[PDB]
From a paper:
ENPP1 is expressed on the cell surface in mineralizing cells, such as osteoblasts and chondrocytes, and hydrolyzes extracellular ATP to produce AMP and diphosphate, an inhibitor of bone mineralization. A recent study reported that ENPP1 also hydrolyzes 2′3′-cGAMP, but not 3′3′-cGAMP, and negatively regulates the cGAS-STING-dependent immune activation. Here, we report the crystal structures of ENPP1 in complex with 3′3′-cGAMP and the reaction intermediate pA(3′,5′)pG (pApG).
We co-crystallized the ENPP1-ΔSMB T238A mutant in the presence of 2′3′-cGAMP or 3′3′-cGAMP, and determined the crystal structures at 1.8 and 1.9 Å resolutions, respectively. This may be due to the slight enzymatic activity of the mutant at a high concentration during crystallization. We concluded that this structure represents a post-reaction state of the first hydrolysis, and modeled pApG into the electron density. pApG adopts an open conformation, in which the nucleobases are far apart from each other. The adenine and guanine moieties of pApG are accommodated within the nucleotide-binding pocket (N-pocket) and the guanine-binding pocket (G-pocket), respectively. The 5′-phosphate group binds to two zinc ions (Zn1 and Zn2), which are coordinated by Asp358/His362/His517 and Asp200/Asp405/His406, respectively. This observation suggests that ENPP1 first hydrolyzes the 2′-5′, rather than the 3′-5′, phosphodiester linkage in 2′3′-cGAMP, consistent with previous data showing that a 2′3′-cGAMP analog with the 2′-5′ non-hydrolyzable phosphothioate diester linkage (2′3′-cGAsMP) is not degraded by ENPP123. The guanosine moiety of pApG is accommodated in the G-pocket, formed by His362 on a short helix and a loop (residues 510–517). The 3′-OH group of the guanosine forms a hydrogen bond with Asn259, while the guanine base is stacked with His362, with its N1 atom forming a hydrogen bond with Ser514.
Numbering used by the authors: 170 to 620, 629 to 903
Write the structure that this text describes.
């Protein structure tokens, strides 16, 4: 009988022919197989359903942005964001090479496009052979290496021939046989484009690839390998239905210009035509502002690339144009109707948290659990996983090694929390006080005389954030209601942590132009009220909100300490004040309290990681005759319990939400004219949600280290991001 007809049985030990010391791994891509195809038509796909039911499955594998074939396939086999592995789209221009990349051109085989270390190169360096029957990058010499058996891409090769060849490769003698294999099919991507994702044609394509996977499995069974092979069935992205009525043309606002080139689609990019001469001198900001807030409920938004949501990690490469566009679901953008393909086809490329962009993942074999359904994870985590299946040490990458251990019968790698590399000190009281220039109102209660586990636990119930910032000088400042990690190198707080219960009340009093000098920290001129007084360029904001006073009735005066302020634009205060005066109270009511950590972010070189000291010094600004460092973003992490009966101080299990809010000196991003503040501030927050791990990378902080969950369980928590359901 066939493999699909056999009953599902646990493979607790690999059942291998004597000529196999261990099971191979096969990575099998079904291009453009959106996660929902299996949600809805699983009854029509018996083979893929058995792999899912007898294996390890997630309803949604999150792809990378932009959700295109080449960036995502290459992310899968490198563990890297496209901005790091260099393949940021199927078509690219590189201003330093002055070259264009495309899939149907000679440049596809130019090794200079492909960065990082794909898994077959990792394997080569560690004496493991590879056999690839198509995979982006696998027919290109990368690090002077090619797969041991590889095929130049040719989409005309019949699907059956591809599967048959891998089955012959598996019969080679040990000294020639690969241990890692790839297979790739162009369906159901092709039918999804030509006829739309919801069509009888896509269904026929799904049935066709399901039959083909069964041909593979039956071949493995014939070879005695169907219980000696770790199968990863995967896709690169999902599929959306495009419309000629949902297509933006920039010539509507710019006129019929030809001095710019637009990469059309849902993740459009813009550069001048006169390159490389004007690639950097072109006035991108003027163009972006001419395209901002032009329509009510505008379905596209221009972004200079450092200002895109950090969760997309789409800016560091010089192949990413300085101007990009963010598109609503189902919408696309081109310069004009002549600079695009057909406007009514299936398409992809959109935000990688859109539901219809989500991808397929099934793991089947000795190493994978049987009948396990796990929460969503990003495809950059798969490289580490394949390294564990193959016995390989991973190259440095963006996956969190160990975060997928719950997919495995017997985890290979036991992860550890990162060490604290900061220099921690106690900050003593200095008895010298200076005039800050403040004009505190009469109802503000002064701190007349300046000169603890329970208080400590209340403020940091999961352990204090750890300082990963190498050799950075930090002292902890304890208050009754919050804890501060204070930077002695920057003279501003790196984080503040406090807990906010459902019944806690906020104060109504004003506290304008009022601060109290923290005698435990060195006094800076940019600590004083007089620095920010009538300062049109810059104001200051608080990390812990002074209106929150759990025990007393007035403004919480300890939150007015100079150790609790950060430089803050007036425009961003609209967001920050609404967040802390309105949203936080509702979230505490919805979540039975929330614990909060917030702080500044400095990522001036837009690489998603904290800046070195030399980078900070280069980006200092003189404002009112003083050097000042203005954060690029502000982060906030909200934690509460899975069970609503528990307060954030007694959680059996954690519920985490994180955000990395851009710190812009206007609110043009939100097109605020005619909108309720309730709507647009919360909409901005949702768009700029992030993984906890994203916050960790960009601040050099590590969270939750005193929790009793295993490190791998905490990595799952910290790598999660909610999908926007359509
Ligand atoms: C995703 O993982 C990537 C791999 O670890 C990581 O990229 C690495 O980033 C570092 C720092 O930018 C680079 O290291 C060196 O870079 C230059 C020389 O090119 C030096 O001046 C630096 O001091 C440093 O020694 C690595 O070259 C780079 N590796 C790769 C493959 O790109 C990304 O930073 C990670 N992304 C995020 C958001 O965490
Ligand atoms: N919008 C759109 N792009 C397509 C379609 N078919 C192929 N492409 C794009 O054209 C390139 C080559 O596709 P392949 O030849 O199917 C890729 O960048 C792919 O995304 C289609 O029907 N619509
Ligand atoms: N290794 C490859 N080299 C070149 N083109 C490829 C390769 N793999 C897939 N393709 C093509 O990429 C296109 C699909 O891209 P996408 O629509 O972004 O999913 C189709 O034209 C495929 O034939
Ligand atoms: C860039 O390359 C193109 C070839 O595609 C060539 O026409 C142009 O002269 C080059 N520009 C420079 C500055 O070398
Ligand atoms: C692509 O594959 C088909 C196999 O059916 C073959 O006819 C064609 O010649 C191949 N193209 C190249 C360039 O090898
Ligand atoms: C629109 O573009 C022009 C450049 O042609 C620029 O001078 C102008 O400042 C832009 N408008 C806005 C509102 O930024
Ligand atoms: Ca940085
Ligand atoms: Cl690059
Ligand atoms: Cl391009
Ligand atoms: Cl629009
Ligand atoms: Cl597309
Ligand atoms: Cl195994
Ligand atoms: Cl715990
Ligand atoms: Zn694809
Ligand atoms: Zn496609």
């Amino acid at each position: 009988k066939s493999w699909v007809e056999e009953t599902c049985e646990s493979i607790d030990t690999p059942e291998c022919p004597a000529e196999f010391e261990s099971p191979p791994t096969l990575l099998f891509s079904l291009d453009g197989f959106r996660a929902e195809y299996l949600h809805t038509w699983g009854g029509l796909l018996p083979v893929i359903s058995k792999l899912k039911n007898c294996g390890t499955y997630t309803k949604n594998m999150r792809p990378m942005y932009p959700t295109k074939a080449f960036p995502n396939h290459y992310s899968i086999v490198t563990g890297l964001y496209p901005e790091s592995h260099g393949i940021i789209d199927n078509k690219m221009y590189d201003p330093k090479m002055n070259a264009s990349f495309s899939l149907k051109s000679k440049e596809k085989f130019n090794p200079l496009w492909y960065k990082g270390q794909p898994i077959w190169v990792t394997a080569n360096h560690q004496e493991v052979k590879s056999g690839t029957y198509f995979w982006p990058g696998s027919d290109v010499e990368i690090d002077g290496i090619l797969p041991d058996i590889y095929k130049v891409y040719n989409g005309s090769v019949p699907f059956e021939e591809r599967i048959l060849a891998v089955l012959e490769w598996l019969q080679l003698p040990s000294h020639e046989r690969p241990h890692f294999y790839t297979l790739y099919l162009e369906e159901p991507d092709s039918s999804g484009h030509s006829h739309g994702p919801v069509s009888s044609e896509v269904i026929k394509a799904l049935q066709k690839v399901d039959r083909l996977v069964g041909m593979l499995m039956d071949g493995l069974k014939d070879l005695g390998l169907d219980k000696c092979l770790n199968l990863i069935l995967i896709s690169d992205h999902g599929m959306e239905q495009g419309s000629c009525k949902k297509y933006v043309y920039l010539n509507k606002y710019l006129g019929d210009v030809n001095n710019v080139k637009v990469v059309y689609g849902p993740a459009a990019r813009l550069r001048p035509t006169d390159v490389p001469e004007t690639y950097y001198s072109f006035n991108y900001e003027a163009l972006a502002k001419n395209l901002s807030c032009r329509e009510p409920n505008q379905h596209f938004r221009p972004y200079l690339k450092p200002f895109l949501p950090k969760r997309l990690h789409f800016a560091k490469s010089d192949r990413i144009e300085p101007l990009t566009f963010y598109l609503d679901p189902q919408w696309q953008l081109a310069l004009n109707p002549s600079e695009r393909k057909y406007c009514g086809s299936g398409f992809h490329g959109s935000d990688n948290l859109f539901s219809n962009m989500q991808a397929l993942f099934i793991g089947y074999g000795p190493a994978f659990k049987h009948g396990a359904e796990v929460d969503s994870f990003e495809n950059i985590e798969v490289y580490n996983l394949m390294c564990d299946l193959l016995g390989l040490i991973p190259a440095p990458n963006n996956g969190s090694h160990g975060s997928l251990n719950h997919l495995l019968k017997k985890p290979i790698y036991n992860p550890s929390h990162p060490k604290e590399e900061g220099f921690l000190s106690q900050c003593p009281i200095k008895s010298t006080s200076n005039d800050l220039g403040c004009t505190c109102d009469p109802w503000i209660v002064p701190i007349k005389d300046f000169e603890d586990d329970d208080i400590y636990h209340m403020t940091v119930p999961y352990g204090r954030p750890r300082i990963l910032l190498k050799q950075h000088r930090v002292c902890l400042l304890q208050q009754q209601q919050f804890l501060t990690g204070y930077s002695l190198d920057l003279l501003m707080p790196l984080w503040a942590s406090y807990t906010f219960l459902s019944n806690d009340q906020f104060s109504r009093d004003d506290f304008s132009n009022c601060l109290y000098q923290d005698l435990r920290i060195p006094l800076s001129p940019v600590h004083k009220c007089s620095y920010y007084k009538s300062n049109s360029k810059l104001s200051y904001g608080f990390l812990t909100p002074p209106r929150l006073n759990r025990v007393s009735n007035h403004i919480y005066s300890e939150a007015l300490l100079t150790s609790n302020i950060v430089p803050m634009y007036q425009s961003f205060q609209v967001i920050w004040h609404y967040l802390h005066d309105t949203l936080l109270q509702r979230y505490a009511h919805e979540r039975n309290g929330i614990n909060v950590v917030s702080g500044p972010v400095f990522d001036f070189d837009y690489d998603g990681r904290y800046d070195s000291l030399e980078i900070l010094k280069q980006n200092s600004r003189v404002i009112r005759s003083q050097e000042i460092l203005i954060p690029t973003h502000f982060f906030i992490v909200l934690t509460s319990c899975k069970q609503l009966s528990e307060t954030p101080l007694e959680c059996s299990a954690l519920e985490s939400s994180a955000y990395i809010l851009p710190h812009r000196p206007d609110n043009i991003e939100s097109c605020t004219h005619g909108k309720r503040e309730s709507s647009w501030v919360e909409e901005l927050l949702t768009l700029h949600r992030a993984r906890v791990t994203d916050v960790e990378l960009i601040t050099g902080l590590s969270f939750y280290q005193d929790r009793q969950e295993s490190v791998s369980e905490l990595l799952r928590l910290k790598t999660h991001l909610p999908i926007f359901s359509q």
